[PDB]
Design a protein around this motif. Structure first.
Motif, PDB file in Angstrom:
ATOM      1  N   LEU A  38     -51.340   1.210 -19.042  1.00 32.13           N
ATOM      2  CA  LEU A  38     -50.032   1.848 -19.149  1.00 32.13           C
ATOM      3  C   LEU A  38     -49.306   1.407 -20.404  1.00 32.13           C
ATOM      4  N   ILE A  86     -48.301   3.779 -23.916  1.00 37.10           N
ATOM      5  CA  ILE A  86     -46.984   3.863 -24.531  1.00 37.10           C
ATOM      6  C   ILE A  86     -47.066   3.501 -26.007  1.00 37.10           C
ATOM      7  N   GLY A 137     -39.914  10.019 -17.848  1.00 37.56           N
ATOM      8  CA  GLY A 137     -41.335  10.162 -17.590  1.00 37.56           C
ATOM      9  C   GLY A 137     -41.816   9.242 -16.487  1.00 37.56           C
ATOM     10  N   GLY A 138     -41.020   8.228 -16.154  1.00 38.04           N
ATOM     11  CA  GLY A 138     -41.386   7.350 -15.059  1.00 38.04           C
ATOM     12  C   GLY A 138     -40.998   7.911 -13.707  1.00 38.04           C
ATOM     13  N   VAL A 189     -40.681  11.137 -12.976  1.00 42.66           N
ATOM     14  CA  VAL A 189     -41.508  12.307 -12.697  1.00 42.66           C
ATOM     15  C   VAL A 189     -42.833  11.880 -12.088  1.00 42.66           C
ATOM     16  N   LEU A 230     -53.481  16.390  -9.672  1.00 46.05           N
ATOM     17  CA  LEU A 230     -52.235  15.809 -10.147  1.00 46.05           C
ATOM     18  C   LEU A 230     -52.063  16.036 -11.640  1.00 46.05           C
ATOM     19  N   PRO A 253     -49.453  20.302 -12.001  1.00 44.64           N
ATOM     20  CA  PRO A 253     -48.203  20.291 -12.764  1.00 44.64           C
ATOM     21  C   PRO A 253     -48.330  20.895 -14.138  1.00 44.64           C
ATOM     22  N   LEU A 266     -43.601  17.758 -32.887  1.00 40.19           N
ATOM     23  CA  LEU A 266     -43.971  18.105 -31.529  1.00 40.19           C
ATOM     24  C   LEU A 266     -42.870  18.870 -30.821  1.00 40.19           C
ATOM     25  N   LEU A 297     -40.069  17.942 -29.118  1.00 40.42           N
ATOM     26  CA  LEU A 297     -39.734  17.476 -27.789  1.00 40.42           C
ATOM     27  C   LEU A 297     -38.322  17.924 -27.443  1.00 40.42           C
ATOM     28  N   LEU A 298     -38.067  18.112 -26.147  1.00 38.00           N
ATOM     29  CA  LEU A 298     -36.762  18.594 -25.706  1.00 38.00           C
ATOM     30  C   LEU A 298     -35.667  17.591 -26.028  1.00 38.00           C
ATOM     31  N   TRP A 299     -35.989  16.311 -25.962  1.00 34.71           N
ATOM     32  CA  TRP A 299     -35.086  15.232 -26.309  1.00 34.71           C
ATOM     33  C   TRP A 299     -35.176  14.834 -27.774  1.00 34.71           C
ATOM     34  N   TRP A 343     -33.445  24.530 -28.326  1.00 30.08           N
ATOM     35  CA  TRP A 343     -34.866  24.231 -28.284  1.00 30.08           C
ATOM     36  C   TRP A 343     -35.685  25.505 -28.238  1.00 30.08           C
ATOM     37  N   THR A 393     -44.822  24.960 -28.321  1.00 35.26           N
ATOM     38  CA  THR A 393     -45.488  23.677 -28.168  1.00 35.26           C
ATOM     39  C   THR A 393     -45.469  23.228 -26.723  1.00 35.26           C
ATOM     40  N   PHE A 394     -44.471  23.661 -25.958  1.00 36.45           N
ATOM     41  CA  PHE A 394     -44.460  23.370 -24.531  1.00 36.45           C
ATOM     42  C   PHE A 394     -45.615  24.055 -23.827  1.00 36.45           C
ATOM     43  N   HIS A 444     -48.764  21.431 -22.665  1.00 34.32           N
ATOM     44  CA  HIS A 444     -49.047  21.424 -21.231  1.00 34.32           C
ATOM     45  C   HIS A 444     -50.235  22.314 -20.891  1.00 34.32           C
ATOM     46  N   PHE A 456     -53.364  19.992 -21.595  1.00 29.22           N
ATOM     47  CA  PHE A 456     -53.578  19.106 -20.467  1.00 29.22           C
ATOM     48  C   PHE A 456     -53.840  19.861 -19.177  1.00 29.22           C
TER      49      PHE A 456
HETATM   50  C1  CLA Z   1     -48.278  14.986 -14.965  1.00 31.05           C
HETATM   51  C2  CLA Z   1     -47.957  16.135 -15.553  1.00 31.05           C
HETATM   52  C3  CLA Z   1     -47.439  16.269 -16.879  1.00 31.05           C
HETATM   53  C4  CLA Z   1     -47.974  15.929 -18.088  1.00 31.05           C
HETATM   54  C5  CLA Z   1     -49.247  15.310 -18.412  1.00 31.05           C
HETATM   55  C6  CLA Z   1     -46.975  16.285 -19.114  1.00 31.05           C
HETATM   56  C7  CLA Z   1     -47.161  16.066 -20.478  1.00 31.05           C
HETATM   57  C8  CLA Z   1     -46.228  16.337 -21.449  1.00 31.05           C
HETATM   58  N1  CLA Z   1     -44.992  16.883 -21.308  1.00 31.05           N
HETATM   59 MG1  CLA Z   1     -44.257  17.472 -19.460  1.00 31.05          MG
HETATM   60  N2  CLA Z   1     -43.382  17.996 -17.654  1.00 31.05           N
HETATM   61  C9  CLA Z   1     -43.957  17.811 -16.440  1.00 31.05           C
HETATM   62  C10 CLA Z   1     -45.241  17.275 -16.198  1.00 31.05           C
HETATM   63  C11 CLA Z   1     -46.100  16.835 -17.140  1.00 31.05           C
HETATM   64  N3  CLA Z   1     -45.896  16.827 -18.525  1.00 31.05           N
HETATM   65  C12 CLA Z   1     -43.066  18.264 -15.397  1.00 31.05           C
HETATM   66  C13 CLA Z   1     -43.372  18.227 -13.975  1.00 31.05           C
HETATM   67  C14 CLA Z   1     -41.926  18.735 -16.028  1.00 31.05           C
HETATM   68  C15 CLA Z   1     -40.739  19.315 -15.410  1.00 31.05           C
HETATM   69  C16 CLA Z   1     -39.616  18.324 -15.267  1.00 31.05           C
HETATM   70  C17 CLA Z   1     -42.130  18.550 -17.443  1.00 31.05           C
HETATM   71  C18 CLA Z   1     -41.207  18.886 -18.426  1.00 31.05           C
HETATM   72  C19 CLA Z   1     -41.384  18.662 -19.758  1.00 31.05           C
HETATM   73  C20 CLA Z   1     -40.462  18.986 -20.840  1.00 31.05           C
HETATM   74  C21 CLA Z   1     -39.185  19.647 -20.642  1.00 31.05           C
HETATM   75  C22 CLA Z   1     -41.058  18.542 -21.987  1.00 31.05           C
HETATM   76  C23 CLA Z   1     -42.339  17.966 -21.599  1.00 31.05           C
HETATM   77  C24 CLA Z   1     -43.087  17.461 -22.696  1.00 31.05           C
HETATM   78  C25 CLA Z   1     -44.335  16.918 -22.538  1.00 31.05           C
HETATM   79  C26 CLA Z   1     -45.248  16.379 -23.634  1.00 31.05           C
HETATM   80  C27 CLA Z   1     -44.735  15.103 -24.264  1.00 31.05           C
HETATM   81  C28 CLA Z   1     -44.142  14.162 -23.245  1.00 31.05           C
HETATM   82  C29 CLA Z   1     -44.168  12.779 -23.801  1.00 31.05           C
HETATM   83  O1  CLA Z   1     -44.042  12.420 -24.969  1.00 31.05           O
HETATM   84  O2  CLA Z   1     -44.372  11.832 -22.843  1.00 31.05           O
HETATM   85  C30 CLA Z   1     -43.499  10.689 -22.829  1.00 31.05           C
HETATM   86  C31 CLA Z   1     -43.722  10.079 -21.499  1.00 31.05           C
HETATM   87  C32 CLA Z   1     -44.730   9.239 -21.223  1.00 31.05           C
HETATM   88  C33 CLA Z   1     -45.725   8.822 -22.243  1.00 31.05           C
HETATM   89  C34 CLA Z   1     -44.870   8.693 -19.844  1.00 31.05           C
HETATM   90  C35 CLA Z   1     -45.389   7.276 -19.810  1.00 31.05           C
HETATM   91  C36 CLA Z   1     -45.010   6.600 -18.517  1.00 31.05           C
HETATM   92  C37 CLA Z   1     -45.270   5.106 -18.627  1.00 31.05           C
HETATM   93  C38 CLA Z   1     -46.754   4.816 -18.612  1.00 31.05           C
HETATM   94  C39 CLA Z   1     -44.572   4.361 -17.506  1.00 31.05           C
HETATM   95  C40 CLA Z   1     -43.108   4.220 -17.827  1.00 31.05           C
HETATM   96  C41 CLA Z   1     -42.481   3.105 -17.027  1.00 31.05           C
HETATM   97  C42 CLA Z   1     -41.071   2.841 -17.521  1.00 31.05           C
HETATM   98  C43 CLA Z   1     -41.093   2.041 -18.806  1.00 31.05           C
HETATM   99  C44 CLA Z   1     -40.249   2.133 -16.453  1.00 31.05           C
HETATM  100  C45 CLA Z   1     -39.721   3.128 -15.442  1.00 31.05           C
HETATM  101  C46 CLA Z   1     -38.980   2.439 -14.319  1.00 31.05           C
HETATM  102  C47 CLA Z   1     -38.664   3.393 -13.174  1.00 31.05           C
HETATM  103  C48 CLA Z   1     -39.926   4.025 -12.628  1.00 31.05           C
HETATM  104  C49 CLA Z   1     -37.929   2.662 -12.068  1.00 31.05           C
HETATM  105  C50 CLA Z   1     -46.554  16.048 -22.901  1.00 31.05           C
HETATM  106  C51 CLA Z   1     -47.671  16.911 -23.396  1.00 31.05           C
HETATM  107  C52 CLA Z   1     -42.244  17.734 -23.906  1.00 31.05           C
HETATM  108  C53 CLA Z   1     -42.980  18.671 -24.794  1.00 31.05           C
HETATM  109  O3  CLA Z   1     -44.098  19.132 -24.618  1.00 31.05           O
HETATM  110  O4  CLA Z   1     -42.322  19.067 -25.905  1.00 31.05           O
HETATM  111  C54 CLA Z   1     -42.838  20.222 -26.563  1.00 31.05           C
HETATM  112  C55 CLA Z   1     -40.958  18.425 -23.410  1.00 31.05           C
HETATM  113  O5  CLA Z   1     -40.062  18.792 -24.146  1.00 31.05           O
HETATM  114  N4  CLA Z   1     -42.534  18.065 -20.299  1.00 31.05           N
END
Ligand code: CLA
Ligand SMILES: CCCCCCCCCCCCCCCCCC(=O)OC[C@H](CO[C@@H]1O[C@H](CO[C@H]2O[C@H](CO)[C@H](O)[C@H](O)[C@H]2O)[C@H](O)[C@H](O)[C@H]1O)OC(=O)CCCCCCCCCCCCCCCCC
Ligand code: CLA
Ligand SMILES: CC(C)=CCC/C(C)=C/CC/C(C)=C/CC/C(C)=C/CC/C(C)=C/CC/C(C)=C/CC/C(C)=C/CC/C(C)=C/CC/C(C)=C/CC1=CC(=O)C(C)=C(C)C1=O
Ligand SMILES: CC(C)=CCC/C(C)=C\CC/C(C)=C/CC/C(C)=C/CC/C(C)=C/CC/C(C)=C/CC/C(C)=C/CC/C(C)=C/CC/C(C)=C/CC1=CC(=O)C(C)=C(C)C1=O
Ligand SMILES: CCCCCCCCCCCCCCCCCC(=O)OC[C@H](CO[C@@H]1O[C@H](CO)[C@H](O)[C@H](O)[C@H]1O)OC(=O)CCCCCCCCCCCCCCCCC
Ligand SMILES: CCCCCCCCCCCCCCCCCC(=O)OC[C@H](CO[C@@H]1O[C@H](CO)[C@H](O)[C@H](O)[C@H]1O)OC(=O)CCCCCCCCCCCCCCCCC
Ligand SMILES: CCCCCCCCCCCCCCCCCC(=O)OC[C@H](CO[C@@H]1O[C@H](CO)[C@H](O)[C@H](O)[C@H]1O)OC(=O)CCCCCCCCCCCCCCCCC
Ligand SMILES: CCCCCCCCCCCCCCCC(=O)OC[C@H](COP(=O)(O)OC[C@@H](O)CO)OC(=O)CCCCCCCCCCCCCCC
Ligand SMILES: CCCCCCCCCCCCCCCC(=O)OC[C@H](COP(=O)(O)OC[C@@H](O)CO)OC(=O)CCCCCCCCCCCCCCC
Ligand SMILES: CC1=C(/C=C/C(C)=C/C=C/C(C)=C/C=C/C=C(C)/C=C/C=C(C)/C=C/C2=C(C)CCCC2(C)C)C(C)(C)CCC1
Ligand code: OEX
Ligand SMILES: [Fe+2]
Lengths: 28, 35, 42, 30, 334, 75, 38, 66, 37, 34, 52, 341, 42, 38, 30
Positions: free
Chosen positions: H35, H39, I15-16, I18, L24, L28, L78, L80-82, L93, L101-102, L106, L109
């Motif tokens: 994990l 990151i 992302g955590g 979700v 999983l 999604p 890329l 990203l929304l943020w 956006w 790119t969204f 996605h 993957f």
């Molecule tokens: C499992 C399914 C899945 C996968 C693989 C992706 C993958 C992606 N999404 Mg996506 N998304 C998903 C589900 C998913 N999504 C869902 C269900 C929604 C609806 C809410 C969205 C809504 C969404 C939007 C609106 C956007 C993306 C975007 C993205 C891309 C970049 C995200 C990024 O940089 O990650 C960053 C996140 C991580 C690397 C996660 C790492 C988590 C680590 C390992 C753990 C974190 C722990 C933390 C530090 C502590 C938390 C504590 C807490 C739990 C208490 C990437 C291709 C962006 C994109 O494509 O832009 C064009 C974008 O704008 N997604």
């Protein structure tokens, strides 16, 4: 239960078709 | 150029006549069922 | 004007891999004639 | 000089088509 | 006893190496003349006035070409649709100049392919087979007669016919795009779905058989040697491949019937190429594809561009450049 | 439960005789009330061109692209 | 040396797979020649 | 089965084969590293993409010392 | 600490959750739908 | 209980009222080049 | 002379004697077996298996 | 027993749609690539990125609608929304082209998650994994076109937009600017696609025409129970047919159905190698021996030099409206016209 | 300036006859492994 | 066809005569190359 | 370009000398 499986695909589809029929009657 | 032309109408209606008189030669009866 | 290294590309791209595939067939038929034990095994 | 290679590739391709049709490994039951 | 019965017994014998049949009486003389003239016209043939403007286009290997650029050039614009055999040409030099061998090859090709198709029927009759392999072969015969025969008819000249080559094919496809807009026509759309779908269900059926093969070999020898030829045992667990695809998408989308499965593999491409070859045919008579140029306007009335307007500017580039000397008047009626 | 036994049942069509028109009309009202032009930023037929800006609007910056689209969508 | 390897196997190529591999090389030689000569 | 002098030295490195730690072991320690490394790759890609701007870090051809 | 760096860690937290609300819902339902031995 | 062919009839002509509505607005409204 | 409206492309008189001797030279072969047969023998089949 | 075993037993349970571990990642991401396309072709315009109309709000039908690539000023962000471009706003956006790119990310993957689905179901059913290896074909076309092609180019702008006519211009953009049909990797790809459609039309029509009599009915579809061990078509007959029609024929059902896997998939791998070579603009544009000769001899014409003049029309006429960011203002007098057209 | 047909003379004068003599050795060892009947005959 | 030929024999080439024939070709290739390149 | 062929012939000749000395078919009594 499979009510979450179909209606994640069908509840959007009827909602967009509510918009695509409305866009036929929109003009300039 | 009128010598070649004679040669073609021989060759065409040679094989066309083998085709025409091939299926007139009781051709439905030539099956593996009987005869 | 053509590239004079293309003759070496094509004519070795033909012959070297195609002569390879002939060899795998000749030793295949030799093993079959080898086991068979008659007039050709030796 | 250049087109001599193209002709040899074409008629050489038609040779292995000839050998594959007539000298084929004839499949046999039992 | 008679000489004809001893000749009909030989020509319809399945005990020959290749079955000749009664269609082979006009398949083999036609296709060997289309072949033996093609090999000579592809290798050694002088340049051909295709545009009718006395600008001869080289197409053979001895005149500085390769496999890609070399092509049997279509006949002249000066001839057009007229039948031009050797004896109606007053010399062979006048024949080869005006696009002679394009008509000799194509007309002996379409007779030999329409006889190769009937020959596939005939042997199915003499072998006890159900007959319709030749209906599946109607789909490339429809498409071969569409670009060599039907499209020169409706355009009124064999010069618009397809050049027998590789670079000549892409001269044919691009000029057909600018003048007819084939990509927007729904019959090229129904056959792209025919061959994308056809290559899908090919590699989807060929994988599920190869996935569910039964153990009959060791790991040293080949996988293929577990099939002895002419055996009566089934060589793969069809229940296994049904339960796989029954979970890969869902249960009710899977053919348990292998006969209805092996029919759908023959339906989808062949129907897709029947429909496509009647796209070239209906566009041979200038019933073109869709035209959505300047279709989206604002309330002021200014033209808002779409993707079809960007596609139009690609068609306008090929239209103003194809046959760059043959035109004299503002509209390509031909 | 089999799928064909569901849609032929009356209790199915009791529920979905209310939900389908209440959801199709909400897709109608999503457009006719002019709401979809503001969520997604799609131009209305009135507002492809403006009185000032008579050309085709384009984004011409990597990072101030949000600020440039605040410019091209006010007038 | 040491003893004989028990992992000795034999290589096979039937007459069918010869004509595939020959035709594979000549058709790739027809296709890619025109580009190599440029 | 031929003893060599270099074979005698390395022999305790190969003498173990297939001993396992019983249970789940150090698998949850590994996933926290995986994990973390996920990151790490996301961050250095977004630095490179100029989609994550760090102060006094500019992705451009810089004057290396000559 | 920048605009871009603060928004990214917020997306990392987002992302955590979700992954989180999918995982928390998946553990609870896996208790109820266990298979008889 | 409803016969299944009545269900495919009413939904089947409902699709025709949806499709022919879409081919209607190709000749009217937006995207019609009027 | 290409666009003349002449039957089967028969330009000269010599090409007729080519056509007549082509159909008839195989017709006479065909009559050696299927000719001189009974023209009055029927069947209530879909297909006849009469003789050679 | 443990917590991992209860989750492993729950996902692999027989149910309506098999979820598994891979669901999983698939369910999604595939739901949002598909829904991102249906939204982007319905509502979101291309008025600011390309200067087009690509939505159903803007009068486009099914054919002329698309989810369009972002601007050239965005580069390869890329989006990203943020991110630094959109900064959390949804509306800005969509106007930059963030949905594209969204969809593509996605979607990439989803194809990862769908190919993992084919390894997981094959291990539970207990079969060889050739579906997951034949599906790697379509993965190599998505990646090397929707991802690896705009990465080698100037930005995401030169990628295929996800719409029907927007693919169609990408077909035309790739002939004029790249000469894609001349590339031997497309030529080996057309041989696999038209070759793969050939094999299923033959194997479809030969199995269905050598069937055995297993019933008295005229319908032959009824006479097949799935769990029977007798083969349903005469392989000896079908070999004897094609050995005399075509001259050579399959005598091996295991080799036949493998050959129906190799031919379509290889045409997607060989054509995927060439499109990676066009990200770098390493195109097969000209035969220089044809070009040096046509320059010195102003009478030598082939079909090949005829295709270059068709490509000057594609490179000049569409590039004004193709690339509004570059602001090509061509005069009327530089555009290559023919005589009287 | 050298003759560009000499590359084709030498490199086919090497490879084509030398790949021939390899084939007569491989089928020789295949016949010996064919008769021998152990682990390699097949 | 007709029957199998009783004049089928086998061809042999031991490892010794391989190295003669290889070295024969390479030394003739060394010798005659300089003249062919001219 | 020309001397590259001469070098390949020379070191290629020294390869088959190496294999003939060390990988020779060792002659055996009985
Ligand atoms: C499992 C399914 C899945 C996968 C693989 C992706 C993958 C992606 N999404 Mg996506 N998304 C998903 C589900 C998913 N999504 C869902 C269900 C929604 C609806 C809410 C969205 C809504 C969404 C939007 C609106 C956007 C993306 C975007 C993205 C891309 C970049 C995200 C990024 O940089 O990650 C960053 C996140 C991580 C690397 C996660 C790492 C988590 C680590 C390992 C753990 C974190 C722990 C933390 C530090 C502590 C938390 C504590 C807490 C739990 C208490 C990437 C291709 C962006 C994109 O494509 O832009 C064009 C974008 O704008 N997604
Ligand atoms: C196999 C199975 C795969 C399964 C599918 C998995 C799908 C996952 C999706 C992958 C996400 C990749 C997209 C990342 C964005 C991208 O790439 O973004 C691209 C950025 C590079 O950014 C670009 O960088 C360029 C270089 O600029 C530099 O140089 C310029 C002139 O020198 C100026 O100086 C400028 O200031 C300076 O920054 C330009 O600036 C571009 O505008 C800018 O967008 O790299 C990056 O994020 C990372 C690039 C380094 C990693 C390299 C691997 C990825 C690229 C592979 C393609 C290589 C190209 C080969 C073509 C074939
Ligand atoms: C006889 C004509 C012919 C034929 C057969 C081909 C054949 C091919 N061309 Mg080609 N081409 C031709 C003429 C032809 N060409 C001409 C004349 C031009 C003009 C110059 C081009 C220009 C051209 C370009 C520019 C490209 C091709 C490409 C290709 C390849 C197709 C890629 C593919 O399979 O996509 C199939 C699609 C996929 C594999 C994508 C994955 C599909 C996913 C999995 C679908 C998922 C959908 C999912 C179910 C959700 C749907 C539901 C949702 C909608 C709600 C194939 C080799 C492409 C290529 O080489 O790519 C490598 C390519 O980029 N061609
Ligand atoms: C609660 C919260 C948080 C709220 C949000 C709501 C929410 C949870 C939403 C999420 C819901 C969500 C979106 C989930 C839905 C999941 C879903 C379906 C997502 C995927 C999205 C998507 C676009 C899917 C549709 C695409 C799809 C998979 C299409 C299938 C295509 C299809 C039907 C193809 C059939 C083709 C066919 C007939 C093939 C058979 C022919 C062939 C030759 C096969 C070979 C063959 C077949 C055999 O049969 C056997 C025997 C053998 C031998 C054999 O050779
Ligand atoms: C001589 C002259 C002058 C020539 C000049 C010609 C010229 C102009 C140029 C042409 C040059 C040329 C050939 C170029 C080709 C270049 C090119 C496209 C290269 C392709 C190279 C290549 C590596 C492609 C990669 C993709 C690939 C592997 C494709 C293979 C396609 C292909 C070979 C498919 C096989 C098709 C095939 C015939 C299958 C049908 C088999 C058939 C007989 C079925 C039999 C059968 C079916 C059954 O169902 C059952 C049950 C049984 C029992 C049975 O038996
Ligand atoms: C066994 C087969 C043995 C033959 C191999 C066949 C390979 C043929 C293809 C390579 C030869 C074609 C080169 C053109 C011939 C020519 O004359 O060139 C000749 C050029 C050399 O160029 C010459 O150079 C001289 C001084 O260097 C002078 O300048 C000459 O003017 C110049 O022509 O040679 C090459 O370019 C050889 C390149 C080979 C290496 C390939 C690099 C690219 C590989 C990328 C790998 C990607 C693969 C991904 C998988 C797909
Ligand atoms: C129960 C679950 C059901 C699951 C639903 C699953 C979702 C998948 C549905 C995919 C549909 C994608 C097609 C979009 C077409 C669209 O809405 O066009 C809707 C558009 C809207 O129509 C346009 O409206 C504009 C309004 O400004 C203008 O008026 C245009 O003139 C007018 O054409 O209609 C068309 O373009 C007319 C032709 C429609 C042709 C659609 C069929 C084309 C073939 C695609 C087949 C897809 C197969 C789906 C199978 C499921
Ligand atoms: C298997 C091996 C296959 C390879 C065969 C190897 C043989 C190599 C030796 C022959 C090639 C060497 C020729 C030089 C290469 C070159 O470029 O030449 C090239 C020349 C052609 O010359 C070229 O010609 C062109 C137009 O014709 C242009 O003019 C070029 O400028 C000119 O160079 O080719 C030959 O001379 C080939 C001759 C081969 C026939 C030999 C005739 C003599 C035989 C006499 C037999 C006596 C034998 C008695 C027994 C001893
Ligand atoms: C537009 C949509 C496309 C057509 C929609 C329906 C598909 C065809 C279904 C009926 C097929 C007819 C049918 O199902 O026959 C199936 C047939 C075997 O059928 P049987 O002999 O079991 O029975 C068919 C008849 O004999 C009557 O039972 O299979 C073939 O022989 C395949 C070989 C030809 C392969 C090419 C077939 C292409 C023909 C399709 C053109 C048909 C148009 C007419 C439709 C009636
Ligand atoms: C007038 C009509 C008379 C028929 C015309 C004859 C032409 C037939 C062409 C012969 C195909 C020979 C290829 C050998 C191939 C070979 O011998 O395979 C033999 C193979 C038999 O496989 P088996 O089942 O015997 O193999 C079982 C295992 O042993 C597998 O190794 O048959 C096929 O699979 C061929 C089917 C695809 C046929 C591929 C044909 C591709 C078309 C030709 C492409 C080249 C054209 C280039 C021109 C420039
Ligand atoms: C974007 C986005 C999102 C969303 C997502 C989703 C949730 C979506 C979904 C969506 C969907 C999922 C959609 C759907 C649509 C559908 C449609 C609209 C359909 C239509 C159809 C049609 C039109 C067809 C037709 C037909 C019929 C009916 C029958 C016959 C045949 C045919 C085919 C013709 C979010 C939030 C994440 C945020 C971010 C971004
Ligand atoms: O000849 Mn061939 O391409 Ca059919 O369009 Mn008119 O003509 Mn010519 O121009 Mn355009
Ligand atoms: Fe099959």
């Amino acid at each position: 239960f499979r009510w979450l499986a179909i209606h994640g695909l069908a509840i959007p589809t009827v909602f967009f078709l509510g918009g695509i029929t409305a866009m036929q009657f929109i003009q300039r | 150029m009128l010598t070649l032309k004679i040669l073609v109408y021989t060759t065409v209606i040679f094989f066309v006549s083998l085709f025409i008189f091939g299926f007139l030669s009781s051709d439905p009866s030539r099956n593996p069922n009987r005869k | 004007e053509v590239q004079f290294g293309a003759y070496l590309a094509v004519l070795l791209g033909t012959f070297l891999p195609a002569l390879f595939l002939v060899n795998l067939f000749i030793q295949t038929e030799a093993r079959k004639a080898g086991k068979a034990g008659g007039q050709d095994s030796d | 000089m250049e087109a001599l290679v193209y002709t040899f590739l074409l008629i050489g391709t038609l040779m292995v088509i000839f050998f594959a049709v007539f000298f084929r490994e004839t499949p046999r039951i039992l | 006893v008679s000489l004809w019965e001893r000749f009909c017994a030989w020509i319809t014998s399945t005990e020959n190496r290749l079955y000749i049949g009664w269609f082979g009486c006009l398949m083999f003389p036609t296709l060997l003349t289309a072949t033996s003239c093609f090999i000579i016209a592809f290798i050694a043939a002088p340049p051909v006035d295709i545009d009718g403007i006395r600008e001869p286009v080289a197409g053979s290997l001895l005149y500085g070409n390769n496999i890609i650029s070399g092509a049997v050039v279509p006949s002249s614009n000066a001839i057009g649709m007229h039948f031009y055999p050797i004896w109606e040409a007053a010399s062979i030099d006048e024949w080869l100049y005006n696009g002679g061998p394009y008509q000799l090859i194509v007309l002996h090709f379409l007779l030999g392919v329409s006889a190769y198709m009937g020959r596939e029927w005939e042997l199915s009759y003499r072998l006890g087979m159900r007959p319709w392999i030749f209906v599946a072969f109607s789909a490339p015969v429809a498409a071969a007669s569409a670009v060599f025969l039907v499209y020169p008819i409706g355009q009124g000249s064999f010069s618009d016919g397809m050049p027998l080559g590789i670079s000549g094919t892409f001269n044919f496809m691009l000029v057909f795009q600018a003048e007819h807009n084939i990509l927007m026509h729904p019959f090229h759309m129904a056959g792209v779905a025919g061959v994308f779908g056809g290559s899908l269900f090919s590699a989807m059926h060929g994988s599920l058989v190869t996935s569910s093969l039964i153990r009959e070999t060791t790991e040293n020898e080949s996988t293929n040697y577990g099939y002895k030829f002419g055996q009566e045992e089934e060589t793969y667990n069809i229940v296994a491949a049904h339960g796989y695809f029954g979970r890969l998408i869902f249960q009710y989308a899977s053919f348990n019937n292998s006969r209805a499965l092996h029919f759908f593999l023959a339906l989808w491409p062949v129907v897709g190429i029947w429909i496509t070859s009647m796209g070239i045919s209906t566009m041979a008579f200038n019933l073109n594809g869709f035209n959505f140029n300047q279709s989206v306007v604002d309330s002021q009335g200014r033209v808002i561009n779409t993707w079809a307007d960007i596609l139009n500017r690609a068609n306008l580039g090929i239209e103003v450049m194809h046959e760059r000397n043959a035109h004299n008047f503002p509209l390509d009626l031909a | 439960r089999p799928f064909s036994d569901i849609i032929t049942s009356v209790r199915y069509w009791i529920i979905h005789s209310i939900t389908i028109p209440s959801l199709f009309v909400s897709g109608w009202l999503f457009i006719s009330t002019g709401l979809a032009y503001d969520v997604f930023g799609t131009p209305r037929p009135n507002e492809y061109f403006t009185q000032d800006r008579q050309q085709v609007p384009l984004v011409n910056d990597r990072f101030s692209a949000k600020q440039e689209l605040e410019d091209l969508t006010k007038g | 040396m040491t003893g004989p390897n028990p992992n000795k196997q034999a290589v096979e190529l039937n007459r069918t797979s010869l004509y595939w591999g020959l035709l594979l090389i000549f058709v790739l030689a027809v296709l890619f020649s025109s580009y190599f000569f440029n | 089965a031929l003893r060599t002098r270099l074979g005698e030295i390395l022999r305790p490195l190969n003498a173990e084969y297939g001993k396992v730690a019983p249970g789940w072991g150090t698998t949850p320690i590994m996933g926290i590293v995986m994990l973390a490394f996920l990151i790490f790759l996301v961050i250095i890609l977004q630095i490179y993409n100029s989609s994550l701007i760090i102060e006094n870090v500019d992705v451009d051809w810089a004057n290396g010392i000559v | 600490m920048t605009a871009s760096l603060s928004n990214f860690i917020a997306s990392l937290i987002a992302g955590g959750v979700v992954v989180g609300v999918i995982a928390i819902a998946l553990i609870v339902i896996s208790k109820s739908d266990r298979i008889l031995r | 209980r409803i016969p299944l062919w009545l269900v495919g009839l009413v939904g089947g002509l409902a699709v025709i009222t949806m499709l022919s509505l879409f081919f209607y607005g190709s000749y009217s409204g937006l995207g019609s080049s009027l | 002379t290409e666009g003349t409206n002449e039957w089967f492309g028969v330009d000269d008189l010599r090409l007729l004697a080519v056509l007549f001797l082509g159909h008839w030279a195989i017709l006479s072969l065909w009559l050696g077996s299927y000719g001189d047969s009974n023209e009055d023998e029927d069947f209530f089949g879909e297909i006849d298996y009469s003789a050679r | 027993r443990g917590l991992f075993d209860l989750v492993d037993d729950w996902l692999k349970k027989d149910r309506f749609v098999f979820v598994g571990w891979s669901g999983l990642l698939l369910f999604p991401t595939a739901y949002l690539a598909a829904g991102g396309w249906m939204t982007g072709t319905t509502f979101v315009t291309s008025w600011y990125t390309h200067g087009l109309a690509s939505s159903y709000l803007e009068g486009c039908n099914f054919l002329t609608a698309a989810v369009s690539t972002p601007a050239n000023s965005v580069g390869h962000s890329l989006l990203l929304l943020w991110g630094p471009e959109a900064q959390g706003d949804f509306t800005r956006w969509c106007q930059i082209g963030g949905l594209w790119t969204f969809v593509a990310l996605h979607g990439a993957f989803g194809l990862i998650g769908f190919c993992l689905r084919q390894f997981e179901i094959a291990r539970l059913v207990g079969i060889r994994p050739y579906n997951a290896i034949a599906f790697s074909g379509p993965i190599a076309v998505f990646v090397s076109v929707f991802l690896l092609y705009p990465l080698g180019q100037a930005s995401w702008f030169f990628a295929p937009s996800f719409g029907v006519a927007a693919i169609f211009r990408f077909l035309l953009f790739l002939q004029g600017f790249h000469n894609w049909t001349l590339n031997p990797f497309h030529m080996m790809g057309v041989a696999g696609i038209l070759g793969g459609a050939l094999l299923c039309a033959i194997h479809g029509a030969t199995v269905e025409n050598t069937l055995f009599e297993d019933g008295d009915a005229a319908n032959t579809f009824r006479a097949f129970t799935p769990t029977q061990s007798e083969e349903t078509y005469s392989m000896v007959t079908a070999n004897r047919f094609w050995s005399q029609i075509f001259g050579v024929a399959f005598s091996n059902k295991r080799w036949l159905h493998f050959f129906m896997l190799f031919v379509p998939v290889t045409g997607l791998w060989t054509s995927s190698i060439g499109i990676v070579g066009l990200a770098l603009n390493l195109r097969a544009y000209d035969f220089v021996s044809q070009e040096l000769r046509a320059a010195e001899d102003p009478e030598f014409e082939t079909f090949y030099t005829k295709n270059h003049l068709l490509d000057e029309g594609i490179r000049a006429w569409m590039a004004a409206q193709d690339q509004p960011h570059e602001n090509f203002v061509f005069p009327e007098e530089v555009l290559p016209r023919g005589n009287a057209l």
